[PDB]
Design an enzyme around this catalytic site. Structure first.
Site, PDB file in Angstrom:
ATOM      1  N   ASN A   1     -26.563  -9.792  -3.948  1.00  0.00           N
ATOM      2  CA  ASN A   1     -25.454 -10.223  -4.867  1.00  0.00           C
ATOM      3  C   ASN A   1     -25.109 -11.431  -4.713  1.00  0.00           C
ATOM      4  OD1 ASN A   1     -24.533  -8.981  -2.346  1.00  0.00           O
ATOM      5  ND2 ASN A   1     -22.421  -9.241  -3.512  1.00  0.00           N
TER       6      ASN A   1
ATOM      7  N   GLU B   1     -20.602  -5.394   7.350  1.00  0.00           N
ATOM      8  CA  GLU B   1     -19.722  -5.462   6.100  1.00  0.00           C
ATOM      9  C   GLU B   1     -20.275  -4.754   5.132  1.00  0.00           C
ATOM     10  OE1 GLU B   1     -20.101  -9.635   5.719  1.00  0.00           O
ATOM     11  OE2 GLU B   1     -18.926 -10.466   7.321  1.00  0.00           O
TER      12      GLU B   1
ATOM     13  N   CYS C   1     -19.047  -7.152  -3.400  1.00  0.00           N
ATOM     14  CA  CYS C   1     -18.481  -6.203  -2.638  1.00  0.00           C
ATOM     15  C   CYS C   1     -16.976  -6.059  -2.715  1.00  0.00           C
ATOM     16  CB  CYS C   1     -18.873  -6.223  -1.294  1.00  0.00           C
ATOM     17  SG  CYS C   1     -19.271  -7.699  -0.635  1.00  0.00           S
TER      18      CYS C   1
ATOM     19  N   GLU D   1     -15.939 -11.046  11.081  1.00  0.00           N
ATOM     20  CA  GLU D   1     -16.699 -12.208  11.323  1.00  0.00           C
ATOM     21  C   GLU D   1     -15.685 -13.155  10.751  1.00  0.00           C
ATOM     22  OE1 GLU D   1     -20.736 -12.767  10.506  1.00  0.00           O
ATOM     23  OE2 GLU D   1     -21.223 -10.625  10.992  1.00  0.00           O
TER      24      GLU D   1
END
Ligand code: NA
Ligand code: NA
Ligand code: NA
Lengths: 482, 481, 482, 482
Positions: free
Chosen positions: B150, B249, B283, B462
């Site tokens: 993406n 993630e 996301c 992160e």
């Protein structure tokens, strides 16, 4: 009898198991095994307690209550000593000076960090010239699942439970089946201290097809922190994977000590004696491989032999006792099996290698002798696999880079101790050891603010200090457009 | 498109097609790395740690990383083109979000590598002479990087930049659907003088392909992954025996919440962006929206209007707002949700199908921006992640109610809140069970902040120092004095 | 009577001075003024104490002892409440819930911080390729001279003494002549808790040509931390200049409150009432200037008038007393002089402006009425000079940028309170205010970990949290070439 | 040829003063001295620039621009070298590898910290149960007044200007009258980089009754940071006292090197040669006192004499040059006044003691010889007062506690160098030396992130890393009630 502690009540269970005193093989107590239904009740109670009074406590009130837990252990100090000693056969003096005070100190240290800990503020610019703020906060992760080991029962148990509670989580903890007494006492301290029901839950049992597996599989936990065998870490990781649970592992070690030609030789002998045989070598941090410079190798082995054979192996309260038994008969079977394997691999047995003969009740207990091997290659199974008994193999070396490479040639990487009087050597060499913890001219000196953990098969994540405050918390970022 | 391994561009005994989703046309063939080649990459990365890369000072490392950045800036427009072609993203967005963010990833972590320091702890001992504990950060080792389609270059570099900044070496598997900008990055690294074995690009898929082989390989020290939660769980099981460090993630089903006291136009604009940006394939996008009852109908009608104003077409078209979905296989998944929405009771306020072009785009993979109302909190369309340009809008009445409704989820990545009230913003934000809250904005990113999710949406953090910690061994060194 | 406390011993002096209860003008006690020779005795003893047992304490043990001091004050809580109230006239309420609990929390917070605090490790590359380490450490600075104010006697006194001791320093401290009692009692608590002789020394007196001055001139100190009037700050800074002593100053201000149109109006009225009249407007942080948006100005002034007139002025232990007297007759003279000046400058007196009529012994005290002014220009002296009594002037404003400039157009910059319910505006406006401390929708809410200090004439440096730990310590860098 | 740079323009002045080359006494340039009026104009323009486009830059753009300044120095690298060499007689090689690269690095390091630095978020509970947030921000302090020394002109000038600008301040900077050239070039580089007018202002001149004092007295600056002699630090502290301006001081020292018997002797001889004679002993970090263990004393002294007499004193571009002249004849007269005092005090002159005879233009410059003394007592003036020339006294010692006491028996405490190969000794001794900077087995190794400063007369405050980001910023606390 040792009961579970769930939602503020001590409860029995349907079945029970024997807690055996490894000094003599006698029964100490019966321990009710929590079943899947009771584990579920503990988890659900712990979720719910997050929405009760516990959830509303200020960080100062929460910390004061944890200091009170700690005051409670202190006020029952000798009872705690007596419980750890019964379960594991550890010398009373070690329980009195290492185990129980560290368990107290764990609670105090993390209660303090709860009060002092803060988070971060980041300013930024934006297109429109008005900017933004990003600030972070720490929240409780949720319900923390603790599965803890038998070698330092109260110390390692509180090492996890203390930061978990300090961060506002609730807890469901499963102490080792081999060592449940002090944990059961901790629950009583919890209760008497007024810890709200469901905050702390104690479930007894084993792993597979028992309380430990049930805990690990339960979807209502937010994290699983575990100290113990590496293969078990791996099993736990697989088990919580579908849930993507936060995990924190302190696992095996095949830890090395290195003694350079410029070491204080007497201090290094004494230090390696302690690192090899403390708690009868049943510490994750113990040195089971030892490298010694060729020029002092013979003198070192001779000195350590003399000192090992002076160790008093006996009763926990016997006069100048240094060493107790192993945790259990079944663990001793494993240790003696490596004892035989080492002879078969071609070891010279410098001392020990068997079980002492007492001609009294201790012969029904689970003792072994402190053992030193020499002459195995770096490939031997006894030099590469964790034994978790009072043993070390000693090997000579000539060159600094060679020994660094031999120490690091390993699927583990928990700790290493180095002996040298040279300023540069201490720092040059330590930074090159692939482990989480190095000690120079000492061993197992612990400052509870430090990051602690391992590399490779020895674990993942770090605990200690802010590392624990981060692991046992949701770190959330909040961004305000202004 | 070749793999890059131990300093060389190399082919494989099998290639796959990379398809332009604007029009269904083949862009290029991509050589798929086999198990033998993945091993070769890892082994070379391992060896790279003991070479010149391993001996660079932190200042020279950062300089070289800044040179990678410069390299990308120098070929900026090739990077824009590569990303557009693979994905169909508006040329403007590739040009002002995607490529600049990738360059900033490298620069920010290079800068952190130079400023980061560690800790000194003094302690007393029995004999009264004391001890010192200090920490150091060292390279973790070989970092396995498996990254999504993406935001190809952005998310690729978000991982690669901190890995390198911390002195690691990297074996990176970009998505099969967006392999182009990564391949260019490898050219930048080659031309920038990055030593062989330091950065390795391997192309392919997941199961029984490069991705799987990477995660199973015992020579890596960590696996960082951005993608589907289920894939996250698969990776965790695969690295479990080597107890590798992991950073995930993963999915979300993110909410946006609009309080009665919000700036209603700003909120409508805000949710429009959060819902349909990148055709809803971030996301971080809002696929659920809660709007206060007193303003619900006016919000829906306004969002309808603006949504219908969005221009869906060519990446370079005059006023283009949306491009296609990444692929036909993904449009299939998304159109299957479009149907499931109807069958579930949804009122379609807008879209809910594909658009008609009567030119090559009909061979592409477009869908329409879509808005639903009328579904229940347990509808599958309201619970499951779709990753298309769609949102459902539901009214609410109470603050505690909407907090509980946002948190009633197995996911928890992000959430946007709209309100002009001070107390409300801070009170409510802190109660949302996600990693990232935005108030009066969305997907505004400061690269120093902790970024990550809770529950199924991830593991670890992160960003800033959290990256510097994840991508390093923290070691404690204790000197008895 | 109130003695000095020097090198483990209470001692008298040649001279003494009276401590007067400001409620009724009656004598509370005689206070012995330390002379130059006894100040020298205090400094030398503090110097030597650094080389005695105090200096051998671990950070842990030092922190425990500082928690004992805090315990010893908690154990005499009500005596300390009594002593503060007697010296100053503050309501018993305020002494019980703000003053004494802070003194106590000051010691506990800094003792905790001493235990948790750590320093830094910096690695670097070198030509020869072997590298170097820099690490820093915190050490005691030396003897800290503390000169403290009468407005928050034990609170601001301990705010300096606590971090000074927590960092391993020794202390020579001079409390205000106007409020010597709580400090003398603190000396008792230290003695009873076994604080080694010389570690904490208490000297009584005044400034010029008295103990305060002597302390500031003495070459034996390492730092001078002071809270109080700006001009005195300047004077101290000149006096330590030859010795280049470290200095930390929290000075005055002419603090503003800003009420925006979207404020919660009742809340803002209550908050400004509190920030103008708390402790009888004798807190460094009180708001003596107030700016209210035009659209709500009249309604705000009317409302504040009503609420200020419901304030109960009277005895410290009187029912719902809101205000006691001012610290002293001399201070009331200065405050009333300002009351007249305001009339002279053309102010409308909305309420107050005088002293209340008690018709009992309180007429012999140092009371004044809570006072509110309107109609003065931004340049008026009463709008620009610190008055340090229970008064505020209120002015209208129209624009946000305008009122930011008006608040910032001052030679002071301690604090500011802002009232608004708007998210953007709270953050946009707060960051543009040229002061050390901004409150939004509240006032004087203290977290002891935060940096506290002012800009321009309002101070020098920051204290609180790590900033105190840095100020009261030598930071030393140690660089090891490897 | 050397003009001031005010509000974006190079302007001349009423008076001028000569800039002389210390290699040969010849005129380099005339420098226009700034009068009180021009100094005011510089401050006022700095205050206005804060309100201009400079004040509005994001931190990313401000950092981008500071890197451009750096880049601009780099594009004119050899002219900066020529300028430094000309004013000071510094060896070209050293200018080319220490001075100018460090000047550029100062800018790059602080531009980078500007982008990475962040602040703090403190959550707290409140009575009403909804809590509050405190967060901090760094803002520009305002106009920073910089007064820098002649010994490392561009290095120390940029060490103040880089962090001042990095934190968004504006600057009025007065470089030393002895070395104005490189600062003037920097002004050109600023102009050409497009630094907005008023952001950086260069005023030339002297101290008292000149640009130095006037800057120091201007009420318009927010801070004054200064490196140089201690008495001048005191004078400065007094002058800004009425203003309560922030101050940061790096003053003199009488730095020791200590060489223990277990040092690598050849390394320590080389290290003390550098620490004693680098830049002709005109670095504030130079060692003028050396203590050597008696067992190696004769060998150390004899070794250092040889290496010292191998030093090439001459022209900056002379084939193997190690040392140039002192900065000025005025400075040489002081240093020779000490060289005599040393003899009159009873010193043995091991080597040097006078000026070398070149028989060429250098005889008209300001050279002295590298000098080594023994035989003086610890109370001799030549062992206690800062000479700031290429000299050291060497004294033997016997005990570790003794040498630590002798090192610390000083009104100064800037830096110390220790030589030993022993691990414990290194750490044990370093922590007991009362200075801000200890080097072990090296000297003047600098990592710009570390705190840098002195104790006692050697200074006030810390610079470097976050210590700089904190000194050059207003730290502000914003407290939001929720
Ligand atoms: Na966490
Ligand atoms: Na790590
Ligand atoms: Na500051």
């Amino acid at each position: 009898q040792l009961l579970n502690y769930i939602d503020g009540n001590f409860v029995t269970s349907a079945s029970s198991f024997a807690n055996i005193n490894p000094v003599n093989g006698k029964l100490i107590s019966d321990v009710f095994e929590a079943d899947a239904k009771q584990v579920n009740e503990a988890v659900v109670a712990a979720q719910n307690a997050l929405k009760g009074p516990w959830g509303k406590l200020s960080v100062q009130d929460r910390a004061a209550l944890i200091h009170k837990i700690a005051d409670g252990i202190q006020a029952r100090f000798e009872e705690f000593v007596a419980a750890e000693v019964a379960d594991t056969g550890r010398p009373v003096h070690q329980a009195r000076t290492l185990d129980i005070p560290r368990a107290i100190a764990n609670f105090r240290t993390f209660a303090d960090l709860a009060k002092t800990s803060h988070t971060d503020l980041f300013e930024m610019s934006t297109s429109d010239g008005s900017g933004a703020l990003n600030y972070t906060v720490r929240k409780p992760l949720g319900v923390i699942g603790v599965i803890s080991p038998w070698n330092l029962p109260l110390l390692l148990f509180t090492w996890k439970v203390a930061p978990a509670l300090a961060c506002g989580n609730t807890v469901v903890a499963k102490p080792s089946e081999e060592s449940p007494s002090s944990a059961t006492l901790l629950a009583e301290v919890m209760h008497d201290a007024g810890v709200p029901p469901g905050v702390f839950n104690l479930i007894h049992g084993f792993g597979k097809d028992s309380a430990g597996e049930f805990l690990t599989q339960h979807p209502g936990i937010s994290a699983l922190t575990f100290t113990g065998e590496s293969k078990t870490g791996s099993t736990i990781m697989k088990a919580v994977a579908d849930g993507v649970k936060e995990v924190s592992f302190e696992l095996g070690g095949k830890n090395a000590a290195v003694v350079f030609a410029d070491a204080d030789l007497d201090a290094a002998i004494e230090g390696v004696l302690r690192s090899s045989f403390t708690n009868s070598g049943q510490v994750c941090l113990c040195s089971e491989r030892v490298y010694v410079h060729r020029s002092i190798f013979d003198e070192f082995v001779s000195g350590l032999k003399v000192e090992a054979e002076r160790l008093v192996v006996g009763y926990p309260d016997q006069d100048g006792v240094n060493m107790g038994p192993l945790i259990s008969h079944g663990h001793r079977d494993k240790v003696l099996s490596y004892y035989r394997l080492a002879v078969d691999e071609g070891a010279t047995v410098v001392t020990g290698g068997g079980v002492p003969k007492f001609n009294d009740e201790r012969d029904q207990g689970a003792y072994v002798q402190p053992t030193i091997w020499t002459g195995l290659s770096d490939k031997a199974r006894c030099v590469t696999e964790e034994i978790f008994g009072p043993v070390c193999h000693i090997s000579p070396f000539d060159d600094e880079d060679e020994v660094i490479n031999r120490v690091n040639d390993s699927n583990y990487g928990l700790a290493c101790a180095i002996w040298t009087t040279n300023l540069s050597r201490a720092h040059r060499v330590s930074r090159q050891i692939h482990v989480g913890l190095v000690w120079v001219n000492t061993w197992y000196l612990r400052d509870l603010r430090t990051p602690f953990g391992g590399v490779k098969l020895s674990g993942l994540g770090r605990e200690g200090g802010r590392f624990s405050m981060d692991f046992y918390s949701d770190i959330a970022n909040i961004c305000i457009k202004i």
